[PDB]
Amino acid sequence: QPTNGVGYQPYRVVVLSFELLHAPATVCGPKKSTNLVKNKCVNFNFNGLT
Amino acid sequence: FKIYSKHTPINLVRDLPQGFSALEPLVDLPIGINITRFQTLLALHRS
Numbered sequence A: 001q002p003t004n005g006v007g008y009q010p011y012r013v014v015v016l017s018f019e020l021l022h023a024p025a026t027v028c029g030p031k032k033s034t035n036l037v038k039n040k041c042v043n044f045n046f047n048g049l050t
Numbered sequence B: 001f002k003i004y005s006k007h008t009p010i011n012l013v014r015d016l017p018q019g020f021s022a023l024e025p026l027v028d029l030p031i032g033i034n035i036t037r038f039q040t041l042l043a044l045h046r047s
Helices: none
Strands: B002-005 B024-028
16 A cells, blocks of 8 residues: 555565576676777777787 | 688589688677587478
């Protein structure tokens, strides 16, 4: 009911379960790209190649 | 699972042509499963 107390009000629960198996992991987090700087001696990390 | 593929235009009637054609990598699949056997899939013609 809409007039119920906070201990009786409906709560939607979503449980995320993370498991690692021997198969290649495909659900990866969003790596954030920086802005590209040219013509200077910089440390580059392109697709894991540093 | 690496799938490499190449399309070649040939005009030989029966056997494999003799030549060189390097296969480009087309798609890499994150499958993580054991595979030991395969089978081709064909299409029937119905009349």
